[PDB]
Design an enzyme around this catalytic site. Sequence first.
Site, PDB file in Angstrom:
ATOM      1  N   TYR A   1       0.797  -1.250   0.000  1.00  0.00           N
ATOM      2  CA  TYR A   1       0.000   0.000   0.000  1.00  0.00           C
ATOM      3  C   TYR A   1       0.814   1.276   0.000  1.00  0.00           C
ATOM      4  O   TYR A   1       0.341   2.310  -0.529  1.00  0.00           O
ATOM      5  CB  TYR A   1      -1.028  -0.005   1.153  1.00  0.00           C
ATOM      6  CG  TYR A   1      -1.973  -1.157   1.006  1.00  0.00           C
ATOM      7  CD1 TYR A   1      -3.063  -1.042   0.150  1.00  0.00           C
ATOM      8  CD2 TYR A   1      -1.752  -2.382   1.620  1.00  0.00           C
ATOM      9  CE1 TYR A   1      -3.864  -2.129  -0.127  1.00  0.00           C
ATOM     10  CE2 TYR A   1      -2.555  -3.485   1.387  1.00  0.00           C
ATOM     11  CZ  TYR A   1      -3.620  -3.345   0.508  1.00  0.00           C
ATOM     12  OH  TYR A   1      -4.389  -4.418   0.141  1.00  0.00           O
ATOM     13  N   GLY A   2       2.008   1.218   0.576  1.00  0.00           N
ATOM     14  CA  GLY A   2       2.838   2.389   0.783  1.00  0.00           C
ATOM     15  C   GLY A   2       3.963   2.009   1.724  1.00  0.00           C
ATOM     16  O   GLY A   2       4.197   0.825   1.965  1.00  0.00           O
TER      17      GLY A   2
END
Lengths: 52, 466, 593, 591, 265
Positions: free
Chosen positions: B390-391
């Site tokens: 996601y990050g």
Amino acid sequence: TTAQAMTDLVMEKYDLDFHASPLVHCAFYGRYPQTYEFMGGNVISLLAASCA
Amino acid sequence: AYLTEKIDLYGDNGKVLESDIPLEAVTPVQNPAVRELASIFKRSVAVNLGGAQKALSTGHYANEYIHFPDIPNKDKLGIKSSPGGKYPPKSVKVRTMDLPLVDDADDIAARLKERLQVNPDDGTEVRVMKKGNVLYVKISEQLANTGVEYTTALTTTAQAMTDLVMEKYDLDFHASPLVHCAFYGRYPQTYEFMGGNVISLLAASCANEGPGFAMRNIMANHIVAATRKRTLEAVALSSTLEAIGHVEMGDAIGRWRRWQALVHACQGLNANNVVYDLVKEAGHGCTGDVVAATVGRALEDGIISVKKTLPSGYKFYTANDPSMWNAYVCAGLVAAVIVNQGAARAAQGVSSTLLYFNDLIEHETGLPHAGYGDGMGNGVSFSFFSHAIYGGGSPGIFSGNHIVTRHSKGFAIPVIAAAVSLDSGTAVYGPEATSGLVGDIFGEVDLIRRPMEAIASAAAEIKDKF
Amino acid sequence: KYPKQLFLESKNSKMNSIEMKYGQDPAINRAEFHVYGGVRQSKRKSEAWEAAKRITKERGIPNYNPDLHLKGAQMGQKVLQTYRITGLDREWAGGEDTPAHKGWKPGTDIAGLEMDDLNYENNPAMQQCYDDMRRTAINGLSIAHETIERRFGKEVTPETINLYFEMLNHNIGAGAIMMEHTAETNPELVKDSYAKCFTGNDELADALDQRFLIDINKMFPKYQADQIKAEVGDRIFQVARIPTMAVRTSDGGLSRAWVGQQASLAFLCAYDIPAGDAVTSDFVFTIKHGDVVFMGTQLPYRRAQRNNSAGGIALGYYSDCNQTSRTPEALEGLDGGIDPVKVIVEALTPGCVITDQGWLHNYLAGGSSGWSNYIISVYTDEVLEDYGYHGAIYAMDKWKCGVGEVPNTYENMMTIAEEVSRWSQKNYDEYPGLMEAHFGGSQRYSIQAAASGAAVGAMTGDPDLGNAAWHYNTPLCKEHYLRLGFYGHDLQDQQNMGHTYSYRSDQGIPYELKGPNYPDFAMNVGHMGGYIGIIAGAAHARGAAYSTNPIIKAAFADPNLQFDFRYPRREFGIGGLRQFMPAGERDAVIPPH
Amino acid sequence: PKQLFLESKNSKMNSIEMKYGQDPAINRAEFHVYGGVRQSKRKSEAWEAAKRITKERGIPNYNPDLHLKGAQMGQKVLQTYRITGLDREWAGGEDTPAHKGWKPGTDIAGLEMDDLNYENNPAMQQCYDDMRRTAINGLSIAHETIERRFGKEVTPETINLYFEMLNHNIGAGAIMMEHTAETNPELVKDSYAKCFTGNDELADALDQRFLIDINKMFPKYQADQIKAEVGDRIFQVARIPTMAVRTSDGGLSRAWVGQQASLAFLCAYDIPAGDAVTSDFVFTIKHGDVVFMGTQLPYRRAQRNNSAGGIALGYYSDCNQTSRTPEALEGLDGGIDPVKVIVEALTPGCVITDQGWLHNYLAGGSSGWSNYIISVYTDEVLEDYGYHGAIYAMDKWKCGVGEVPNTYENMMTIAEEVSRWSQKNYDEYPGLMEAHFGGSQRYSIQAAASGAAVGAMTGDPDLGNAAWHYNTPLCKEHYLRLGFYGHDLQDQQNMGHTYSYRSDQGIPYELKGPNYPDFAMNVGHMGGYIGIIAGAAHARGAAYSTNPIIKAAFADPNLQFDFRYPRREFGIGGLRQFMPAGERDAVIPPH
Amino acid sequence: VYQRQFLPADDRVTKNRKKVVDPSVKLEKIRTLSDKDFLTLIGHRHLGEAYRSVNPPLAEIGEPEDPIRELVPPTEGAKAGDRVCTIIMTDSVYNPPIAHYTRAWMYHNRFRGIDNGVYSGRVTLEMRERDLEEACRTLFETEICDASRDQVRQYTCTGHSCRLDPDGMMFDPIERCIMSGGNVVYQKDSFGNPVDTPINMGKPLSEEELIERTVVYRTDRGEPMTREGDPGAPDEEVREALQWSRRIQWLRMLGNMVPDKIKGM
Ligand SMILES: C[C@@H](OP(=O)(O)O)[C@H](NC(=O)CCCCCCS)C(=O)O
Ligand SMILES: C[C@H](O)CO[C@@H](C)CO[C@@H](C)CO
Ligand SMILES: O=S(=O)(O)CCS
Ligand SMILES: O=S(=O)(O)CCS
Ligand SMILES: [Cl-]
Ligand SMILES: [Cl-]
Ligand SMILES: [Cl-]
Ligand SMILES: [Cl-]
Ligand SMILES: [K+]
Ligand SMILES: [K+]
Ligand SMILES: [K+]
Ligand SMILES: [Mn+2]
């Protein structure tokens, strides 16, 4: 420092209950930290917010 | 009122540095070495002369694989540049130039210092490093304090370099944008001096998460590189930057001030040798052995006591000193990372230790963990965002200003610094990859590389004032 | 003393939402796997595979191919469940034609929707809900009228205001007024763009052209109209909606700029002000800065946005744009009494979909899934519905009072949360088909937390205490199941066990004014919409017409909106049926397709 | 040889006379005799549609009779427009995703102003959407982490599987998980991912459906130049759904590709779900080895990456693909034609920066400011003036393009001549003066033509743009008027700033952009600079001006917009013949 | 050294939790796996294959002088420079002998040098390769692994919350396990890859045996964490896990309001 000191000292001076924490914070900080600014708060600088 | 309670400051070898120090004397609002650390971050920059020279010579300005092409072989390209080929093609050279910046580094440093200096003997310093490839620059307090911002070393150095290069080589009008680009990169199309050759330890002043976050926007990799992986010095640097940041955020005030000061002293400065003692006791074991050592030390020192014994025999503990209990959990948390990630010599599990040291503490005691939720919360967020699509990223790219890891009030980033210090090279975004120049150049500053002894000595100098 | 669970028997249509997924009793812990034909069991995924083959042949690059699923196992080794929208059989109002669809027959169910029908990427009702929020610009007009009267020297009257609004409705989407030889926009592309006003002064409202009026007296029940009008007072507020197509070329920050241009022009043209007179700059400044209400505030650099992004919208502004608070269902649905639970469960539906799918997914992360099953769970099959009403039933009996009237003590919050957590767990444990339907721990954990907060907020009227109950569900869930949600779910839950009543710098803030930039909330699905619902219901339960901003509440009471903000669960279902016509499409200027 | 605006080179159309049916040299017109808006097909149709809309929704909308003081718009001729230069194209006839192949050489004339309004023109919108939905990354770090941290070899076969999986998941599908929602493929058929490399052996080993083929797309000398910069590296070019950016912003692109590329790595290499290596993939895509179309913007105009305001002028130059067309390679009697490059690159440069960005982000309204900018790509006016300067300079300096010495004196000489020629024509043709009725159009056009000539003839992009600003006194002291009130902020100040090195003044034109403070507000400028940068590089023999990765990344026939022929594409949108991506037909009621 | 109590253990369920997490309690071995089968199931390395490295041996990398690091002896995998590898297991909601948070607590109490993530549907353990192999003997061979309810699966992990199959087996989309002659056998490795011969795990436990050893509370069998008469009742009338939960909430709330508020509480 002034916003936090005001919030803490008011909570202490009037021996406020837990419900008051967010509301007294809002009274000084406004919409912070949803806003970077202390937007609509009651601590004012001649300088703009440091994001700007 | 002053924080008069006395602590002993121990070095990372477990021997006392200074005894009988009032807590007040290590706080950022008082301690001269802590304050000088902030000042050096604010006033120092590096000028990459080799990088500027290369950009001008090849046309590889700024970042992102940018290239302004000069074509020296136009008549060999198979094109006509004149209708009907009436006139043969002629090459031009319009975006690039060769300036001997590295070879001229000593004179350049002298010209730079003269432009930055405000008065003789004001403390302005320019040092040639890397055989001329890099200048270390420290502006005077006089210059740095003229206005209100921390960016003055960055901005004055970039302009002074641009002006002095234009003058020294008596360059023509065409060179102005190009020499500017060599130092400033993409500024002002970008707010950052993006892809330029003037570097600060601090991030661009557009990048804070909130007011007071500038000393928090420093990656763990930078801290580890600057301290050359000496675990507790990395912890001390990170913890002290976090302590300064929390003053600037307004959170070291009033009924929170003691709590915040104790996080710094106990987790960051090995107060009363707690961190060292916990690692020594539990180092041959697991995270849970540090849990046992932490609860035992809190009991030994009278910080907690048995409150109630339930019918099963399980005991709730009470905090006789809640802020000190929190600080002992923070000390145990860094010790737990040192034991767990130290055994593996691999940083990645730091996020798991952050979560489960705190979770085990609560299940063991019936007392709240570090930050009343933040230690576990950031264990959760940091674990997720270092192992998912996601990050995030690997441990060393996080900081006190990163959205994933900002929440804990000063006791999370130092454990990242510990874990990354202990890593044997298991990352691809390690300190060598993200922070090599930072470590090589700014790591030469003794106060940055080795803050513990400086902070302790400065505390001893002022101890009698409280 | 508890009724049969709503997820086994909807109140009026008597549908068994969980049994319908399987054709088997959901109490039975037995299922066959690997017998469904993979994606062949899904109409949408089967249709998608056929479409993908045509697309590959046309463009020369392969696309959707279910046979790529790992290690030879197509998706669909278990049942790929369908879904029923919660509560539609208990609606009786809202049957008007809307700009997006002919009138819904209130009480009609929407069942058998596939997961892909409720994916934000595939669902224009969800996209239009966000677009309607972000294309809205709200302003007081008092300063513009003052500038005209004093600096320019011309009287403002109902007649001049009516001309101003007629001109603004000509130019906001389509036309020009002052200049020769000026390009204009095709009216078909901008038929969703218009401007209205509202006022607390009934004599002024009656003097204005009603086509330009949001009529507070007509839209709201009397007690709510009284409260809103008392706040608005003898002032005029403009509500302008710029074209959906325009925000889809850019951002919601366009809205105040665009209305700044077009409102300034409408002032120049209605009042005959010379082109280039200095007063002009007061109009645009008033609209952009001087007297302006935004749906959202700006965001800092890592997630940089101008005004009117989803991440800048305060939770209480999401609460107050929802219009369920003024519906008959919310006013009389508890045997003639107000129903704050209906408000909560409706307001949390755009709250969750917009913050999680519209924002966390479609701005901060993304991909082809829309994280849709995670969030579908909060507005389908009556599961959260049953648990939330359960807490209200329990509390009304225990404290012998109505909604909004349980004392707002920490002890009372903990008692209600313990019971709602207990009930949630009893049902997930006793119904294997329900446990399999809500197969992700996050769905089950958020649902018990949301139901607990819904009950506490509805029963005490206190929005911070209602949301405190959410976070208390963390140990109640974890110590029972020994699992919670996805890897990063409980960041905010763990920390808000402490932050809710902290006043540290970036910790304390009332729930009304929290939002997706409150740092605890800035990353993770499954939370913010719940808080949004709880805020709305807490205000409803204590007798208020709104929670946070009366201007926002009034500004969304507008039947010309493309999305029906009164009945969002229904609207999302209509989009799932492919029956919602959004605004912003470019049919007028593209080839036959 | 007649001016191009009186006689197009091949079709012999008189673009100015066609507006009036009268000799454009005659200073006479009748006014108030056209029936107001009735002379316009689009505005008349709009009025009829508006009446239906008012009936249906209960609120009035478009009403031409509101025009001030009883004077409908159209008291003068509401002119039509002809796209410049389409009769001089001979290539680019391939079918595209947006339309069946154009027949090169076919004119588009008689367009109304409203057909070239950004609000009404999906070709213009799609041009911007294609820019901002693009994510570009080096893959070397992701491959390094797989080989060293995870312990698996990367080969052409694993790269092919990775790309097949990324093309499944970027728009539509899932790979790893059970019971996962997916997107209707019809809504995302414009979303896909490819790669390019300077290593010809690697390129030839990959499935070519996934390859941007530098050798095929570019002429030899340009391919050589680009491949030398790319080297033995692989770059990924991913385009996320147009529909997705239209729900959000271009900053979605790197985040979205971060998710989907990470998944494709996990699934192509069989990496456990939750392995620590996963975070290296998303970090590489979002931060570690990334090229953006646009950089972030500061708070007053806050944006994440990939907004139009963050796109450097030279990135606008290099996304344009006219530089690799036959027209640009052989159009000057067998020689390269940097003027064709300039005038095409400035078309998206002006439309996207002024209509897409200054209008559709910073200001707005129903006009699109369309007539302002239509003037720079229609009726061969700027075209004539730019070629005039090139021909003048080639004759005077006895050299080809890119070869006039780049002295300040030579810049001023060329600027003086092109300014003179522009003014001669506006003064001698009252119909042309009325066509370009706004001073800004006429002022920008003489400045643009001057900068085009200097950039094309010297190869120096900063000196070419210096010539733009020198047109300020040359225009003002002749006519005693310039443009709109606020036009000459940047022109006045860049007479000084071009060769300044003060903090926020100095910067090479390639890396200037809409956040350079002088340029941040005003129409009629940035696209001209963009064209000049592109043509200066073309003229000196280069394949790009600023970033070879950008140039290669837009050499892609699967793009919805044809970046090779933007004037043509905007005209096709004006004919309502451009099918954009991002529409929601698959999931909405029949219409 | 202080003697840990770990967690409140007032009933069979929580005493089962305490046994799992207490490193002084030996977990009984209930099955034998050949070295070949064991490594095949893990799927990172096969019998006789050399360990891969992510970095050079620790003694060759030039660790800095660092007194703290001295106190922490590296694991054998760290000394060798092994790559850090992941193993993933999933425990059904239906009466497993270990569940997901108990895995984290156990791992952090029993194994040195770990990374570990807890999710609803799986739990990761990430360790230097040789160290991971040693840990997996405990994970696969002892009483915390019932073949039908605690399974190894590196991805496509859905099943923890799905209904049990007709044989009482937890669902696996990839079908790495199958019930064969009453035994649970891995017919594919943890990655879903082919195996030369299936890996026999032996017999699963019956439901009553699982219930005797389970760490989860379940309402349907009569053992919820929160009983019907527990909400709001005094601490002395509720389970110790709920007493503990209440205490943590009160102390986090009050302490984060003002730390001194929890002194002596
Ligand atoms: C973490 C951070 O990303 P970076 O680490 O900065 O790349 C941040 N994204 C997010 O918060 C993604 C949130 C949505 C995905 C998780 C849903 S549970 C952002 O874009 O600034
Ligand atoms: C942690 C402790 O058990 C909490 O006690 C509360 C139940 C009661 O305490 C409040 C009412 C006064 O501090
Ligand atoms: O497996 S993780 O919890 O990291 C992501 C769930 S969508
Ligand atoms: O009249 S002004 O020059 O201010 C605006 C022109 S569009
Ligand atoms: Cl502020
Ligand atoms: Cl910078
Ligand atoms: Cl204290
Ligand atoms: Cl072996
Ligand atoms: K009305
Ligand atoms: K291809
Ligand atoms: K010169
Ligand atoms: Mn259509």
